[PDB]
Amino acid sequence: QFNPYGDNGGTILGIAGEDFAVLAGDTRNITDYSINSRYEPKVFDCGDNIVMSANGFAADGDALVKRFKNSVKWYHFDHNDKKLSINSAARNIQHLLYGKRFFPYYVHTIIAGLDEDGKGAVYSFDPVGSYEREQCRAGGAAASLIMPFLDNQVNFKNQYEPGTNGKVKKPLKYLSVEEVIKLVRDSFTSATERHIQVGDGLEILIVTKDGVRKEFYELKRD
Amino acid sequence: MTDRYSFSLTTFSPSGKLGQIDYALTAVKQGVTSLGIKATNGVVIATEKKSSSPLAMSETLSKVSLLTPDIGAVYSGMGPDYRVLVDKSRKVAHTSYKRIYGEYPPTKLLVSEVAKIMQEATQSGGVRPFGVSLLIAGHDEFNGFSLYQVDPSGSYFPWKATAIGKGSVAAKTFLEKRWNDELELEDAIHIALLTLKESVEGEFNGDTIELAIIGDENPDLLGYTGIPTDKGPRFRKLTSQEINDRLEA
Amino acid sequence: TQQPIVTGTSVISMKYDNGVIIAADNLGSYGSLLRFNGVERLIPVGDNTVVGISGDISDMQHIERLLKDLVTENAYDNPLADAEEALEPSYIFEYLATVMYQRRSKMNPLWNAIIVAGVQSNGDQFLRYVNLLGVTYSSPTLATGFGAHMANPLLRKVVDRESDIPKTTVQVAEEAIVNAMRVLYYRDARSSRNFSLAIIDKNTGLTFKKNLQVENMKWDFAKDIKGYGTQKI
Amino acid sequence: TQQPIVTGTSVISMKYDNGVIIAADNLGSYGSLLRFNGVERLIPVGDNTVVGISGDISDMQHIERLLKDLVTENAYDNPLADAEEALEPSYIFEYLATVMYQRRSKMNPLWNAIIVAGVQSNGDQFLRYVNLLGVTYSSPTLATGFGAHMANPLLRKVVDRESDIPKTTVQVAEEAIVNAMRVLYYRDARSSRNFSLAIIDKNTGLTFKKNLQVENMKWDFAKDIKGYGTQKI
Amino acid sequence: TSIMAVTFKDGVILGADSRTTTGAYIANRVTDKLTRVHDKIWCCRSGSAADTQAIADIVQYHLELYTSQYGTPSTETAASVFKELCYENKDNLTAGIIVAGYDDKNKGEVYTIPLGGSVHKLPYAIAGSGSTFIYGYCDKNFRENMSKEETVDFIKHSLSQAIKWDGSSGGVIRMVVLTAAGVERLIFYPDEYEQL
Amino acid sequence: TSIMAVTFKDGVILGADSRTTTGAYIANRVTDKLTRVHDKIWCCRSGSAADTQAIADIVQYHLELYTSQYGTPSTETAASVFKELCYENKDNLTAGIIVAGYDDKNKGEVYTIPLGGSVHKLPYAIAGSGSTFIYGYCDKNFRENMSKEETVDFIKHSLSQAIKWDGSSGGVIRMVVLTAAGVERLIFYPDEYEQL
Amino acid sequence: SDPSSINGGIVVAMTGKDCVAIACDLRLGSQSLGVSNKFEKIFHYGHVFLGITGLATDVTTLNEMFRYKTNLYKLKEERAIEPETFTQLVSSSLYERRFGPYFVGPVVAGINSKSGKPFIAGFDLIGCIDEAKDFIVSGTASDQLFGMCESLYEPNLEPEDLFETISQALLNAADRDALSGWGAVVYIIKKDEVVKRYLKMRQD
Amino acid sequence: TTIVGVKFNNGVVIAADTRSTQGPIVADKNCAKLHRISPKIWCAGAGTAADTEAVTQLIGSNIELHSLYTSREPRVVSALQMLKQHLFKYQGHIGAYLIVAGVDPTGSHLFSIHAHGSTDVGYYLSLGSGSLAAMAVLESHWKQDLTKEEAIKLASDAIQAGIWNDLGSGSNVDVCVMEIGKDAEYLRNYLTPNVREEKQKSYKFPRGTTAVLKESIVNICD
Ligand SMILES: COc1cc(/C=C/CCCN2CCCN(CCC/C=C/c3cc(OC)c(OC)c(OC)c3)CC2)cc(OC)c1OC
Ligand SMILES: COc1cc(/C=C\CCCN2CCCN(CCC/C=C/c3cc(OC)c(OC)c(OC)c3)CC2)cc(OC)c1OC
């Protein structure tokens, strides 16, 4: 019979920095073993210095992105052009999602920007609206390949101070946007080696107090 | 159908001899002479290609057989028993070795396996022992070069050099006083050529003599290139032109 | 929730320096039965847009008349329906896309895969795809069904990245499409020799070629093929 | 355990005062495709027995071979192979009913329904049924498939019980059978017009009629029939 | 069942066997599958008899209402009412319908509406279960603008083959002729078409 | 698959299309479905390609052994061997085979062994998915004792029709002529039979 | 109901310069329930090492079986088996059960005592051989392991450098796996000597 | 997997992609899918890998054993008959899908075998997930009377179409050229167009980073 869902592949990643935030995804779009496109962006600027990715079933992903963009615009209309802060956008998104609790949006959603204190923010969502603010989150195909790496090379997990022999944890001094980007790139190149869904291209959106910047890097095409 | 011989055909006599094995052994003694020599860098096995009628074909008479690309065998005695034994031998090298470890058996192991087949024929119901002795020459990587003799009893032993069949006692004596442990392959071939001469009653050329070497890897005989880790067979049967060519000595 | 009855196979297409090309064979199959040979599956809307439809043919005809209604209604109270406020390729796409995702969401899909091809007013090439799930994507080449597997690899050899498009001429583009249609005829069991092809160029406008045949086929070597292994005669 | 592929439909039969008549049409169906028309489904065994067969045709062909072989072997070391020790109808049937049952009991049946018709050497009529289940029974009338639904009710009007058999002549009984065959051709969608019929009479022996056709059909009234309730033209 | 409609010079002829079956049992052997939805607009029905009688009844009602408001409907319009009912109710119908009729503007016309609710205008149309067997025959024998006698024979032969092979078909061959002259009903009995 | 064998004046001809599919993908467009089992005894393969090849392979063996022992086999003998295999292994096979052979006593002969194991001797036989569409045509157009060029034409036309309608048929038309004169292989390409 | 995931466990092996490393977690669970913290999954037969993840009963059975076979190999061949040859023995023994296989994922590691060349290899449950010169992973956290290794790995790492890498890759992957953990073991292997370190990890 | 076979004027060439996949994970980025049956009969395999090697070696073993018995060079048609009769026996449960090519005393041969036991003959063939992309190329550029160099290029482009356009295929192209009067030529990694870019960072750790509980020597000697 008719099955209303599909999988389009893709992998996405968000790291919340100090005064910045990044949200990256591959630009490949797949169906089974076929490539639909080598460039089909999946990470979007939504206004109010908020970036969003809804990865998984692509038709569902775009429905959700469109609805949220609409929510931002209508929030302006209804609240004297007030800025939709990231935490509010996050609560808004829970409700968008939970509204379809019995015919879910088959997607895993991440948003990124800056909170009210200027600190970097990343929010991660269920397909049905459950959420948390997080330091960093990968979602989609290669998420299980990237998540352990980021655990290690970002939170310095299982690393201890040389010579103390596991008595002093290696201290987690935090990272420039430039270092965060190297980590993102190496995560994706590691991803595309070992996962058939990840490849083609990497688009990264960078959120600063000065707004949203975009960067692109090619990936292996096989 | 109705094979009712489930009892053994080789028994112990009261003297303690196993008659049928002695008789098989005897049939070997009356077989054409063949010999082997181990050099430092190779082995040679050799025998006489005694044509019955000159209408028979020389090549058709193989007494020297590849078993494994690094293992050859030759015999004295009943030739049909040998042909059969060769085919069991080749099959067992695959069946109990190549298909399990992914490589050809080392030379002693293949030998103990031919030995096994022969022993059973001295004990299984309804059969007689094989009427052959084999010399088997090979090279594997951990034992290097080796040369074995296997008898109809199932016994086998490693030799620096030996011979079986008719002229064995003369050949063994002559071999004993020419073998040192510093022969090149080439020397041992020449010695094998000498020792054969005495035992060969008549015409003595490259078409009446059979010769094999277990030597260097012949990547010319591989049939394919592209895998450097795979070199050619170490086994090589000499051509009549090759034998004749160095018969000038 | 339905199941398709009368069907159309691949729609294939790409974009070249000045516009787009889109092709589709003229057949509606009824399962294994090759039932209807006159089926036009390229739907022109205006003169900047062709819409190629594969999938259920009853649903295509429905979509087809939606498009006419869309042209009629655009021209209501519109003195600019023949310029500036004429139908744009992207408008026609967003509409279809909207309907597709809505029908999927009602658990009663329009059982199709659509490729919308044309040239926007500014001059930009438009090429996008939507299917019975409402899934959408764009690429310099696009294809449905078998075309996805056999046509796309041939077409991507010509236009493999965006930077290849201003390099590709109409002749080269049109060449590829025709060869692809032949390969499909060789290897797709639901396909047809007769097909239609449309070119929408930013300077020549819409060019629509009907009743094309697959030509230049290699069949000769079939005389030498005997048996399935050991037979010599 | 299997399923029938090429199949034969009704076999009908009854007994009259001096013997038995049995009949069967000449069709081998393949699902709804009426594939083979020269299929003989009545099988005479010597000269006092006809076995009529419906069901799977490959299985019929097998039973056919079993019956020639039964005849070959009855001859072996039997100087009375055509006298006091010829194949009797009761012998052939008991044989057959035995194989069917074993075949069902191995869960691999012969997909058939069988009627064995004949006259016993003492003059007695033989008529008995057996099918894929090994089930057996006798009656003055017997039919398989649609025949048991349509043919029996007609045939039973000529011969309701035992005492009716002596009163039933061969002219009457044959006419009843040919009628029933026509009814079957009217109403059974897997039937054919061409059929075969056999009489096994205790004085005249085995008479075997072939290439019969159903004749005297009433179709004319159909011209006066129009629409499906409300139509007038 | 086996049904067809063929266009020719003077108009259009519809044909059908007269067998409806419930399994292997022939429920009706004198069925009339040629159905009037207007004076010169007829249909061939196949599929569920209930679904197909009901659809025809509704179409008859629609064109009758059409007629009293806007005069005589086009064959094309009859086809449209059919498609509309068949397409929008595709989940709950098993109907395959050939619509055929005559105009003085348009002459003979044939539309086939298969299980889709798709609609197709053809020079001729075959359908029903018996139709598969005569696909080759009809493709080799249809000529455009045949005479009435030619066409009646082309249908006679095709339908006799379909009936021959398909056990779902049989009984009489019925025809309905649609010309400017009007409406002529033909019948052909087994003994006639069997021996062809 | 579309296949047939037809007997004529001087023997018998076999025809097949050349298309093998898995799903809707044509895995081979130049297949040879005409298979030699003896010099003058060939067969037509339809069904599982594995099953059908494996069965032919075996029959060939059986007839090669028969030959050694008893001289040249009759076309009916070849049929019985196909039959035995097919009927005895009916649960695990999906094969429809046509068996065709020349022999001086009874000239050309055609046997059909469909699914199941039944065996049918006939003037001609058709089989394969494509066969359903040409039943009407073949029946109208077959006559016995045709010339060799009439029989090639009859087969070329039937098959081109079969190919036109069946998506699981296509490619080239292969024929094999079994005559007293010997064995001839014919081939017809699309640009030839499509224009028919 | 997925036999390869009842018990949990992982194994990873890497090559460095004139050395190899092989490591496993120590967990044996019955689905959600942790049962043992001492279920080592790495075995040795001479200088050849075998790691086995998958169904615990088969792990044990397979280890006892290659013990038995490699013992016999020694008695006949008069030498120890080499990693290349043993890989072949593993492959063919698994294929003997092609239609009722052991539900395991073997990994072989060792140095060739004649060539000195470092060797690792992996198999599926029916014996297909994956020989690679970089790393081999197996277990319930194999995707995690793949992600870690592909990032952490350099060629030619000295033994003590290699130790750091292999440990960090195992540790960090088991931590993203509900079915792995409870301890870890790492073998650093050179033709000379072999060192075995137990690791300190979270116990949850 | 993408494998092809192309006959040329005086021989036959086969090629294969280099990627092995567990579901969507790349398990081996560089495996050889080209198998020797006998020195001049090569095989390309797609499907269940264990079956692809096991069936190839069993027939290989037997082909050798049989050529030693008969004192003849092994024939391609014998590999074919032995493969097919073995696959057929197993009713498809041995997932072996093979392109078997080679040269022998009778000439040059190209066959394909499906798991169920059916075989095909052709001048060009493909198998596997990349089958359709490769065939698209073959079907467009093939012509009778190819030179050896043309057939290598043609075969190699076919594998390429699979690498790029098929998610089941990638990395490298292996080729094997079996010409009539010469040795079979086996070009492992004949093409290596998927070399990983340099990473942005080095993930080498400080020594002592890892926490250790116990250290111990293992005994590997008698
Ligand atoms: C003459 O009156 C009758 C009418 C009928 C009813 C006729 C209706 C036929 C029903 N169907 C047959 C026609 C075909 N069909 C579907 C086709 C099957 C192919 C599967 C498929 C699925 C897809 O879905 C994803 C496809 O799209 C990619 C696709 O590609 C073409 C193919 C299903 C339905 C039956 C009769 O008895 C035998 C009868 O006789 C009295
Ligand atoms: C791609 O298409 C194909 C598929 C196949 C493989 C599958 C085909 C199966 C077709 N069947 C046709 C035969 C019919 N069938 C089942 C129904 C059998 C009839 C039962 C029956 C029993 C009776 O009494 C025991 C009957 O009489 C009362 C009766 O009346 C019809 C019917 C199922 C199977 C084989 C092909 O040719 C070799 C082929 O090409 C055309």
Ligand SMILES: COc1cc(/C=C\CCCN2CCCN(CCC/C=C/c3cc(OC)c(OC)c(OC)c3)CC2)cc(OC)c1OC
């Ligand atoms: C890593 O290795 C791989 C493994 C696999 C998994 C195995 C491959 C399967 C191959 N096939 C795909 C499926 C289709 N197929 C046959 C179709 C089914 C036949 C059953 C059938 C039987 C019948 O009875 C005769 C039928 O008739 C009733 C019938 O209906 C028409 C269907 C044949 C071949 C797939 C891969 O590609 C991504 C792959 O990478 C190269």
